[PDB]
Design a binder for this molecule. Structure first.
Ligand SMILES: [Ca+2]
Ligand SMILES: [Ca+2]
Length: 605
């Protein structure tokens, strides 16, 4: 039966994409530790560019890999709708695709204008904290006739074209809108030629190494499938002859694999599947042979554990991408030997990622045996001090994320959040992987978990007040209060906070004689005290205007030292807020914190 529960893995992969969402989240949000974020995206250009997915463990919205991710997910859903239907994940796949496509629509204000990036890679990567409280500015970047991007435009066109097929039967109106956008985007890409990275500051992250030739063949094919317009298939087969050859021969590239950059490999198979021409079959075969048996003595590096290691970065992502295409190809080819070779290779690579390896551990967060616990992801970590080192363990479980894994062919791996190689996570990492899982569910089955996602509970008070006696006295009480915002369910801002300290007026003390002073207060220092009833009074500290958020050592807290002097007769033992306050800084349950007038911590008299 299933060696691993492929349905559960796919179920968790869909949750991962939901955790990567940007913009205003829906009522039905399943990720309780995620809230609204990136709400002012596009503001700098007068457009609403909210929505879409955060690329990896950061908060930049990189259009090139985001679009590729969409095309791959749609492809898997087209190949194996049954896998998604049986795992009960089809509605989640559609919800994820609609989320990203709704953004592509927003990002395409007019036929030849495509916004391909929101956020600056360097400014974004300098800060380590939750998406909900990002403090930096997020610029919008685009490509147009003046500075084109055939690669990213053609990819987005393919993503929308491929997605339309998925929605065709459900929402024919939406499917039509997607196809219309895809057509315009492809014309733009075909007419105004250029590499997008020459126009937007994405070179250091997602540089178009292969160029755009591969995206022109890839986009044309998908448009053919979405429209049925023969001209597109003609266009694909024409552009195909200009694909990159390798080193010294006329053999088309067969030593790498399909990913966000080079789609050559996918077209080999897609066209072979579509036309049946020996031309495509020869290329597809050479490539898949290099990954399995080798061609001319050369073969992709293999670990003793049986993992295909193509490169240091996203090793598992690469193996997973190849595994998916191998499964698609294995169905079209007639040769029984090649069919078995490719199919078995695919299953072996996915199984390795799910736990069938020398470490006996899953490489999918929150899944299987001994999974990674500390993926390199800002929001999942939940740091409130702008530090990748604290807290030690991630505060949230990023269910479903496939990590980079072993970067070398030695099966070695250490679950370290600071290791951006082994523990990196990203939308494209789960694309081919998910599609492969859909195929495997259809073939081997598996059952999804009835109660998923689990509801996480906070690791402590999120927003609270700590206090301690600063200086002992008899005619006064001097408190050292600390307001803390270490929220993570979800991380939130506290910019309208005030707190009250209640006390009981004592015999012989005139309230007109009570003074509240401070030698250090990050908030306001009040002149009066407030009378409730009888001899119950309170001092109110006003911190409104102060942005207290989990985004740094100074940002997450406000220190407030305050002395309430009442003169002889002052007696704190009958003061409500005084209960439990000692000489060590600790949570003060009787000091109440208000967020715009609404109690958030402590209990009042
Ligand atoms: Ca390319
Ligand atoms: Ca008193």
């Amino acid at each position: 039966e299933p060696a691993f529960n492929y349905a559960e893995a796919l179920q968790k992969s869909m949750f991962f994409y939901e955790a990567q969402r940007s913009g205003k989240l829906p009522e039905n949000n399943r990720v309780s530790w995620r809230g609204d974020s990136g709400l002012n995206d596009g503001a700098d250009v007068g457009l609403d560019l909210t929505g879409g997915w955060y690329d990896a463990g950061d908060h930049v919205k990189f259009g090139f890999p985001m679009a590729f991710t969409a095309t791959m997910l749609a492809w898997g859903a087209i190949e194996s709708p049954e896998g998604y239907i049986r795992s009960g994940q089809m509605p989640y796949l559609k919800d994820n695709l609609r989320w990203v496509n709704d953004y592509f629509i927003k990002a395409h204000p007019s036929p030849n204008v495509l916004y391909v990036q929101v956020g600056d890679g360097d400014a974004d990567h300098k800060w380590w904290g939750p998406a909900e409280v990002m403090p930096m500015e997020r610029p919008s970047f685009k490509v147009d006739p003046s500075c084109p991007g055939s690669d990213v435009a053609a990819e987005t066109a393919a993503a929308m074209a491929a997605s339309s097929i998925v929605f065709a039967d459900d929402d024919p109106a939406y499917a039509a809108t997607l196809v219309q956008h895809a057509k315009q985007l492809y014309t733009f890409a075909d007419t105004y030629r250029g590499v997008y990275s020459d126009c937007v500051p994405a070179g250091a992250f997602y540089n178009s190494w292969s160029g755009y030739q591969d995206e022109l063949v890839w986009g044309a094919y998908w448009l053919y499938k979405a429209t049925g317009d023969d001209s597109y298939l003609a266009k694909a087969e024409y552009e195909y002859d200009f694909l990159s050859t390798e080193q010294q021969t006329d053999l088309r590239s067969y030593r790498w694999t399909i990913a966000w950059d080079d789609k050559s490999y996918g077209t080999y198979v897609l066209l072979a599947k579509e036309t049946g021409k020996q031309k495509y079959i020869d290329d597809a075969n050479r490539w898949l042979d290099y990954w399995t048996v080798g061609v001319n003595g050369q073969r992709v590096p293999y670990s003793p554990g049986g993992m295909a290691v193509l490169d240091t970065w996203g090793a598992l992502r690469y193996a997973a991408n190849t595994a998916f295409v191998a499964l698609v190809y294995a169905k079209v080819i007639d040769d029984p030997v090649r069919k078995q070779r490719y199919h078995d290779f695919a299953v072996r690579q996915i199984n390795y990622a799910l736990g069938d390896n020398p470490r006996n551990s899953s490489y999918v967060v929150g899944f299987g045996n001994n999974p990674p616990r500390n993926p390199h992801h800002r929001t999942a970590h939940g740091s409130w001090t702008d530090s990748i080192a604290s807290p030690a363990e991630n505060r949230h479980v990023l269910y479903g994320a496939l990590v980079g894994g072993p970067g070398s062919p030695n099966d070695a791996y250490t679950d370290d959040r600071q290791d951006y190689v082994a523990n990196e996570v990203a939308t494209d990492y789960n694309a081919g992987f998910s599609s492969a899982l859909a195929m495997l569910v259809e073939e081997y089955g598996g059952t999804p978990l009835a109660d998923f996602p689990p509801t996480e509970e906070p690791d402590g008070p999120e927003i609270f007040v700590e206090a301690q006696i600063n200086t002992p006295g008899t005619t006064f009480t001097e408190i050292k209060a600390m307001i803390r915002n270490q929220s993570g369910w979800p991380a939130r801002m506290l910019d309208k906070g005030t707190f009250r300290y209640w006390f009981t007026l004592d015999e012989g003390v005139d309230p007109a004689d009570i003074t509240v002073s401070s030698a250090y207060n990050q908030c306001a220092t009040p002149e009066d005290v407030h009378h409730v009833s009888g001899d119950l009074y309170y001092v109110e500290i006003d911190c409104t205007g102060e942005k207290i958020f989990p985004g740094g050592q100074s940002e997450h807290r406000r220190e407030v030292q305050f002395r309430i002097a009442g003169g002889p007769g002052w007696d704190p033992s009958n003061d409500w807020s005084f209960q439990g306050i000692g000489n060590e800084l600790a949570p003060a349950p009787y000091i109440v914190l208000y967020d715009d007038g609404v109690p958030v911590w402590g209990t009042a008299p």
